[PDB]
Amino acid sequence: KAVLEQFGFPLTGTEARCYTNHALSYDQAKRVPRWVLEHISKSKIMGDADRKHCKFKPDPNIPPTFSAFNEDYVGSGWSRGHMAPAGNNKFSSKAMAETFYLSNIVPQDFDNNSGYWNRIEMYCRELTERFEDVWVVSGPLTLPQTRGDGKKIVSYQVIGEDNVAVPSHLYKVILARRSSVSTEPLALGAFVVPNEAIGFQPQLTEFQVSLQDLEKLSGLVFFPHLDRTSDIRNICSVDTCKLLDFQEFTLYLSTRKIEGARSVLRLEKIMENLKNAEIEPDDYFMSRYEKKLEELKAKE
Amino acid sequence: AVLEQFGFPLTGTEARCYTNHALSYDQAKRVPRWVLEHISKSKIMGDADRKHCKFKPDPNIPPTFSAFNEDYVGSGWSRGHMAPAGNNKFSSKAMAETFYLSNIVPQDFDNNSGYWNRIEMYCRELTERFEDVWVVSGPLTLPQTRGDGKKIVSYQVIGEDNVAVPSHLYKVILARRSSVSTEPLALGAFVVPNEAIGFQPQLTEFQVSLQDLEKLSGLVFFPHLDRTSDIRNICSVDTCKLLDFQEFTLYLSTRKIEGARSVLRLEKIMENLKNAEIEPDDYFMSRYEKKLEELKAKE
Ligand SMILES: [Mg+2]
Ligand SMILES: [Mg+2]
Numbered sequence: 001k002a003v004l005e006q007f008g009f010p011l012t013g014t015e016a017r018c019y020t021n022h023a024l025s026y027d028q029a030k031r032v033p034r035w036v037l038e039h040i041s042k043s044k045i046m047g048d049a050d051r052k053h054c055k056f057k058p059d060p061n062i063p064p065t066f067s068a069f070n071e072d073y074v075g076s077g078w079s080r081g082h083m084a085p086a087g088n089n090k091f092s093s094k095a096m097a098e099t100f101y102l103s104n105i106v107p108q109d110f111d112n113n114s115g116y117w118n119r120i121e122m123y124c125r126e127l128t129e130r131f132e133d134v135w136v137v138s139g140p141l142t143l144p145q146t147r148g149d150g151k152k153i154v155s156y157q158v159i160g161e162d163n164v165a166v167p168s169h170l171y172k173v174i175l176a177r178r179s180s181v182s183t184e185p186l187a188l189g190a191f192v193v194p195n196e197a198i199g200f201q202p203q204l205t206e207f208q209v210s211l212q213d214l215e216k217l218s219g220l221v222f223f224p225h226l227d228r229t230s231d232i233r234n235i236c237s238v239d240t241c242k243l244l245d246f247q248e249f250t251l252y253l254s255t256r257k258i259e260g261a262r263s264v265l266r267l268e269k270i271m272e273n274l275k276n277a278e279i280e281p282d283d284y285f286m287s288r289y290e291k292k293l294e295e296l297k298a299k300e
Numbered sequence: 301a302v303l304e305q306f307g308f309p310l311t312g313t314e315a316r317c318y319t320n321h322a323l324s325y326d327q328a329k330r331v332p333r334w335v336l337e338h339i340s341k342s343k344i345m346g347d348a349d350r351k352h353c354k355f356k357p358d359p360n361i362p363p364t365f366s367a368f369n370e371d372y373v374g375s376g377w378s379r380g381h382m383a384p385a386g387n388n389k390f391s392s393k394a395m396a397e398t399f400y401l402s403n404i405v406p407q408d409f410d411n412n413s414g415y416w417n418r419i420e421m422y423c424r425e426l427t428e429r430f431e432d433v434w435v436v437s438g439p440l441t442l443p444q445t446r447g448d449g450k451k452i453v454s455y456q457v458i459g460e461d462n463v464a465v466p467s468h469l470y471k472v473i474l475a476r477r478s479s480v481s482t483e484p485l486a487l488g489a490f491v492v493p494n495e496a497i498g499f500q501p502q503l504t505e506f507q508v509s510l511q512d513l514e515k516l517s518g519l520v521f522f523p524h525l526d527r528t529s530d531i532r533n534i535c536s537v538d539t540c541k542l543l544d545f546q547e548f549t550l551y552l553s554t555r556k557i558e559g560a561r562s563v564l565r566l567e568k569i570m571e572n573l574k575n576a577e578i579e580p581d582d583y584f585m586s587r588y589e590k591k592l593e594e595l596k597a598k599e
């Protein structure tokens with residue numbers, strides 16, 4: 001071993017890298033994370049960290065020769081997709097900024113990012129209403145397709161001068177613990193979604209896969225300390241695996257748009273769109289709406 | 301601490317060390333990422349016999365991430381050694397470990413028995429001129445540019461376990477003249493397509509900068525090597541000259557002698573060699589006559 005190692009073994013750069021509220025293993029060949037692990041709680045998703053102040057940038061800890069850069073993404077047709085989302089880190093502006101390091105980012109379909117994937121992210125945060133602790137591992141996959149001659153082929157686009165790999169699919173593994181002293185079994189689910197637009201017809205359980213199947217697809221072992229001889233419940237049986245429906249999600253998005261409205265006309269438009277979609281505003285929308293109206297009336 | 305309560309995901313990329321090679325395994329592709337070996341005059345000599353070895357799953361790899369012979373047999377692809385059997389004549393154990401599928405990628409049959417074998421033979425030849433030679437070999441899946449300018453990585457996966465077929469193979473060669481020599485080290489990096497390659501392209505046509513290969517592979521090779529110091533191009537201080545058609549064909553024909561089971565087959569080896577317009581050398585005729593006497597002395 002000494003003779004072989006005389007000038008060192010090759011370095012793969014796969015070591016776990018830690019940040020304020022997430023950790024990841026980076027793929028230096030694909031210029032994306034292999035996996036990103038985070039922990040979510042009630043208190044971490046509250047706070048005044050503001051995603052509007054964050055900017056994407058290369059992770060300063062990655063050797064530049066293996067980093068992606070914003071030039072790889074901008075104008076590629078793909079969005080910069082967070083694996084650990086900014087919204088899980090309202091409690092810390094530093095933790096949020098670190099999710100904008102490109103080590104946390106994959107090329108993601110714009111509609112998937114702002115649609116189905118966002119709804120899954122929101123469900124992960126919703127779980128903290130019912131579980132004290134939630135762990136999530138997120139990452140990309142490049143899965144095979146069978147072509148006309150029966151051969152199975154893995155095909156993926158690489159974008160930019162740095163050849164950043166565009167995944168065919170994205171995965172989440174969700175682990176939830178009711179409390180730190182409860183004897184209730186842990187709840188786990190694994191999900192794989194295609195990196196494309198997905199509407200409201202498929203329920204999250206349609207994308208659920210067995211943990212063992214995802215490990216075989218990804219070449220990873222998730223939560224290895226987790227005792228798999230003990231009883232672990234399917235998260236979609238003990239919990240809901242119910243994403244926000246069109247009305248709830250549209251109301252959510254419309255409420256968010258209030259805070260960026262720069263004129264009274266934009267506000268009324270937001271209201272009229274909601275009314276034309278036959279969605280009634282809830283008390284929270286009306287609170288934010290009326291406060292924004294008064295704010296805009298008091299500004300130049 | 302909470303984040304890590306149930307462990308980080310395992311990627312399984314730790315270096316795995318064997319008798320005369322080491323590797324880092326890719327559990328998703330079911331192939332090595334890199335295989336490092338050391339070659340010397342003495343290691344390529346000995347009585348270890350490749351014909352006794354069997355391909356098998358590496359007993360150290362979790363079965364869920366291992367390839368199996370069933371993935372390769374009948375796939376259209378050969379089981380290609382990264383660390384070759386022929387570098388381990390000194391040790392039957394070392395050779396057998398190169399037949400663990402953790403050392404194996406799906407390799408084009410003609411590439412395996414042709415251009416890649418010629419590169420393997422050149423690496424062994426270097427031990428005549430350098431006391432120590434290190435080699436890192438591995439697979440690559442590189443992109444091709446489509447008609448619209450889109451760059452696409454496409455590779456086949458074979459068998460029930462979806463073993464990844466590389467588009468290209470790489471070798472990094474590092475050579476040191478002696479343990480007491482002052483001259484700089486010799487290094488070369490090479491990338492060849494995983495397809496039939498004839499005798500026209502010289503090895504230097506497939507040479508790449510170390511930096512370029514590292515960018516393509518996501519690897520850093522020989523990290524203790526001080527690249528500040530002057531490291532010479534292996535193809536400048538040595539020849540990077542592969543065996544030509546006549547030399548290689550003679551080599552292959554000489555090998556087929558030892559497996560001849562009849563004077564009939566033994567004469568057809570001679571015929572094929574001559575009909576290739578190659579004349580036997582003294583060594584060929586030596587082994588040929590030894591085998592002729594042997595076969596006449598057997599049932
Ligand atoms: Mg997103
Ligand atoms: Mg071979």
